[PDB]
């Protein structure tokens, strides 16, 4: 219940790396219905965020796909 | 479709050329907004996009959308950086955010765009942990139900 509370910022990466890892050792010791709610919750948060990205689009130089096409060899 | 593709990225395929093509916009624009800075945003994309390739593996559909396990892994790497250092449904996103109170607003543009930590608003606005906290979640509900 508590727990639940960290899984807004935790999807928004809204804690420091001490944080997340503290938040990830608790919902590894946590009972699987209390683990379910919480990722179901970063879950949903991811998927608007992704969506809401739209908001933000910014269209790449021609360049960049060139070497990140490339780097996969 | 988009997971489809991902799921073909690992080992090679020229999916990679279409889920970049069909993504990159959105990953370039979420970090120059976060970054600020060409140069930066630029590397930081060629990361995020090396990281999909060699992580792609990693990904399961049944967990959460391509779409949303690129652009978190980006935003993840993108805030990193300041830390540690069509116009159709852009324009249908923007009426949700603008929708939203102005505490509700500010909660997203500090923690999201601005990276900083639901700490390190909480400090910076006078208010409780129990708050920010709350507020944030409000925030996402709203959005949550506008988009839908």
Redesign the interface.
């Known amino acids: 219940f508590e727990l639940l ?2 899984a ?2 935790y ?6 790396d001490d ?1 997340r890892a503290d938040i990830d050792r608790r919902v590894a010791a946590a009972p699987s219905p209390v683990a379910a709610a919480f ?1 179901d919750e970063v ?19 021609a360049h ?2 060139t ?3 490339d ?2 060899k | 479709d988009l997971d489809a593709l991902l799921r073909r990225v690992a080992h ?1 395929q020229a999916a ?2 279409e889920f ?2 069909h993504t ?7 970090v ?2 976060v970054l600020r800075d060409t140069g930066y945003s ?1 590397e930081t ?2 990361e995020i ?2 990281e999909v ?1 060699r992580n792609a593996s990693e990904f399961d559909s049944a ?3 391509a ?6 892994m980006a ?2 790497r993108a ?2 950086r300041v830390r540690c250092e069509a116009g159709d ?2 324009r ?3 009426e949700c ?1 603008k929708a939203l109170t102005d505490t509700q607003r500010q909660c ?1 543009e500090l ?2 765009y601005g ?5 390190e ?1 909480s400090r910076r606005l006078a208010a409780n942990l ?1 708050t920010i ?2 507020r ?2 409000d925030a ?1 509900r709203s ?2 139900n506008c ?1 839908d």
């Open positions: 509370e960290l807004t910022p999807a928004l990466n809204a804690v420091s944080e990722n879950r949903a948060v991811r998927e608007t965020m992704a969506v809401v990205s739209a908001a933000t689009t910014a269209e790449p130089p960049l796909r070497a990140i096409l780097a996969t | 090679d990679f050329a970049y093509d990159k916009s959105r990953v370039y624009g979420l120059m907004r630029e994309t060629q996009y090396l390739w967990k959460g959308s779409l949303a396990w690129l652009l978190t935003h993840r805030v990193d449904e852009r249908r996103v923007t955010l997203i923690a999201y990276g900083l930590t639901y700490v608003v129990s906290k709350s944030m979640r996402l959005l949550r988009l």
